[PDB]
Amino acid sequence: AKLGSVYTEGGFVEGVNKKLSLFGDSVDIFKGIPFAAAPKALEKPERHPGWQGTLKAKSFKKRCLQATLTQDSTYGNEDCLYLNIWVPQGRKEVSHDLPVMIWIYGGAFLMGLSNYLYDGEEIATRGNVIVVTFNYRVGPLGFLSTGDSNLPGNYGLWDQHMAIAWVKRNIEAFGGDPDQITLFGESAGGASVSLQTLSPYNKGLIKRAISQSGVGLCPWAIQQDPLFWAKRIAEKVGCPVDDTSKMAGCLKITDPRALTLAYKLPLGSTEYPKLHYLSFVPVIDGDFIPDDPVNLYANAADVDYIAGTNDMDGHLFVGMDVPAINSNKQDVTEEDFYKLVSGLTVTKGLRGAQATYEVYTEPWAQDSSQETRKKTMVDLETDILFLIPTKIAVAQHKSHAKSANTYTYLFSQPSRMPIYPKWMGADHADDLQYVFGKPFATPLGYRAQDRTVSKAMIAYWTNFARTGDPNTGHSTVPANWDPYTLEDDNYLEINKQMDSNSMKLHLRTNYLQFWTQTYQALPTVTPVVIGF
Numbered sequence: 001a002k003l004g005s006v007y008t009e010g011g012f013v014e015g016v017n018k019k020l021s022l023f024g025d026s027v028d029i030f031k032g033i034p035f036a037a038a039p040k041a042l043e044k045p046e047r048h049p050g051w052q053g054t055l056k057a058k059s060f061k062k063r064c065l066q067a068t069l070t071q072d073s074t075y076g077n078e079d080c081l082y083l084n085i086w087v088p089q090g091r092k093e094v095s096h097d098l099p100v101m102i103w104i105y106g107g108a109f110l111m112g113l114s115n116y117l118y119d120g121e122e123i124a125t126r127g128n129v130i131v132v133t134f135n136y137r138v139g140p141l142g143f144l145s146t147g148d149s150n151l152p153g154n155y156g157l158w159d160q161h162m163a164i165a166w167v168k169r170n171i172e173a174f175g176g177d178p179d180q181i182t183l184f185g186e187s188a189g190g191a192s193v194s195l196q197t198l199s200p201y202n203k204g205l206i207k208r209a210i211s212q213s214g215v216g217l218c219p220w221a222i223q224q225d226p227l228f229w230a231k232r233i234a235e236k237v238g239c240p241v242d243d244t245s246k247m248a249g250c251l252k253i254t255d256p257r258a259l260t261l262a263y264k265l266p267l268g269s270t271e272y273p274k275l276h277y278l279s280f281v282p283v284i285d286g287d288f289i290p291d292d293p294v295n296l297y298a299n300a301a302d303v304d305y306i307a308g309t310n311d312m313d314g315h316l317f318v319g320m321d322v323p324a325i326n327s328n329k330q331d332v333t334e335e336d337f338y339k340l341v342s343g344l345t346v347t348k349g350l351r352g353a354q355a356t357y358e359v360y361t362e363p364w365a366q367d368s369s370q371e372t373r374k375k376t377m378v379d380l381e382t383d384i385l386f387l388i389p390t391k392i393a394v395a396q397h398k399s400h401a402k403s404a405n406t407y408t409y410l411f412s413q414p415s416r417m418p419i420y421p422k423w424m425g426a427d428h429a430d431d432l433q434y435v436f437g438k439p440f441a442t443p444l445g446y447r448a449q450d451r452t453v454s455k456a457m458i459a460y461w462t463n464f465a466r467t468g469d470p471n472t473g474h475s476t477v478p479a480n481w482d483p484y485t486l487e488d489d490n491y492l493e494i495n496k497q498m499d500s501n502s503m504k505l506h507l508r509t510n511y512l513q514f515w516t517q518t519y520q521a522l523p524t525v526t527p528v529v530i531g532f
Contacts, residue, residue: 001094003028003087008170010034011051016058017089020125024091027125028174031084032061035166036159038079039137042144042151042252045081045162060084060115063135064142065260066529069111069267074257078141083134083163086124087174095175099129099465102167104160104185104192107529108139108280109265116527122437126455127462128474130176134163138188139263140233141256143280143532145226150248152285153226156532160192161201161288168205182208182304182465186429188281188532190214190307191221194393197303198296199288208304208468210461212411212431213313213386215393216293220275220385221532222282229279236262265531267320272343274320275385281532294392297400304468305401307394308409308491311425314381316528319420321381325374326420332373334361340377344384349525356380359514371423379511386428387508388515391489398484405468406484408491410507413453429528431494435461449496452478456498479503 001024002017015030033055036045064080067073089095101124105117120131136142136159145153168178183193183206194216196202197209214221223229230251231241237259239250251259265277284292315325321340324330341360342353360376361368368376390408398406411431415424433439434454439446456478463473470481470492478498482490489506 001089001092002026003089003094003174005054006030006173008033008173009166010048012054013057014054015085018121026089027121028087028089029085029121030057030174031059032057032082033085034081035083035134035163036081039081039155039159040252041078041141041256042155042248044155044158060118061135063106063114063118064137065256066108066110066138067261067263069109069265071261071264074260075110075114078256080135080137081159081162083132083166084118084120085174086120086131087176088125088128088130095130097177097180098175099180099182099462100167100171100176100178101129101131101182101184101462101465102164103131103133103189104136104183104196105133105187105189105529106136106138106156107188108142108263108278108531110527110529112527114527117432117436119436119441122441123435123458123462126437126440126458126475127465129462129465130171130174132163132167132171136160136163138532140259140280143223143282144230144233144251145223145283145285146230146244146248147225147227147283148244150244151230151251152287153283154285154288157192157195157199157282157288160196161199164196164202164205180207180466181205182210184210184212184461185214186212186432186435187214187530191216191218191282191532194307195221195282195289195293197300197305198293200290200299201288203299206303208464209300209306210464211305211307211390211393212435213309213428215307215390217389217393217396218385219389220278220281222284222289222293223279226283233259233262272346273317273340273381275317276343278531294396297396300397300404301400301402302404304405304464305394305397306407306409306464306470307390307397308411309382309386309390310428310430311410311412312378312382312415313386313426313428314383315378315420315424316428316530317385318377318381322377325377328421331370332377334373337361337373337377341380344380346526347524348519348522352519352522352525355514355518355522359511359518371421374421375423383508383511383515388512391507391512392516394484395486398486407464407470407481408484409481409494410491410504411494413495428530431457432528452496452498453494457494
């Protein structure tokens, strides 16, 4: 069986059908379906006008404007609000009531086909679920804000919400169950997933959610001072910074490609960690995000939730702050480490920096090797940027959850990157190739253990999407994943060895204690994509 032309709110769409076996199995692939009219710079998205005939949804549309780490040219196009769908099909009849997984992924900066992480075929077919990938506005075009009416901000979030509302209204025609939507995404997408479940705008739309290395409680997920950054990029492009209204009007009119290129990620030595410069992110606009995310968990009370991080999630970032971490030739001193912590602890000044340098150097047993120091730098950023906020998000979700499940994991499959050190664990986004089944899609570049991890991850993910329990659904699982409880703080460690010892307890509880107890008590003084 195969869908023909599917009716959507704006008209008919037609994709392609890829035969998967002699059994008559296949997968219906739709690419380039608009979920909104091409967006006006810095304005909320609107419904796409109706069209006659059949929209040929046979190829990926350009994604929104973004740039690479070199930041010399832009990629994408402003006209980018399109989505893609994969519908696994059986023999007798087209699929119906299938779980719907919406992948939220996108960033202002890419480091490395470009639609590698936008193809949901492996996931949809191995897990028997519908996968929807789409594009949303990123960087300044997606998140510029003046902190007021002149430019409320959160455009990329509105775009995501638009895609979600569209899937809710139209996925049934594709064979999906509108009441079984699972949002999943990593990094900014992960924080986005979190933010979407917390926004009152998504009431009744989301069933479950998966945050991979990113939650709305992450420090880098909410910009506390958007006006400061709005003014900076504005002045950089020749706009009036005198009054917000005129500045906003100018930003809406300036060249989108120049505006995009004006968003710089300083790779040269800086006083603050790189993450400080990834300023164009969501803001508490009192609308889409009506309050600080931590106070919005009642909105996700009935949303099943899986949130997790990677072994060395912070490696990618700290390696930009301290490049010597990756070099076996160059060394790192206690000074370099103190400088790193001070930059990360500005809010609590010298005391905060001292308390932090102390705790993280305690395990050095005053005779630390280079590998030890570099590993500690990675742990520091992994903790602050991902582990800790995820731990409290998971905890907050469990505590407020009503009829919703809460699970947490630690992805620790060691990096295969030759450039990085031998002791390297799972870096930021390393989980993606497994979640997206690349060891199967593109086998020749992978080993048996990679297929094992991928199989396990897609299984857990798609099972969760179907039942709200990673253990049950369309796939068998290599290990029992127990739901997270506050008392036990249990998590599944995902890697090539999934066995009886896979469920672990209390991950870095001492560090969680430091940050939430010690640190917070101190007085306040002052092909991967990153950023929102």
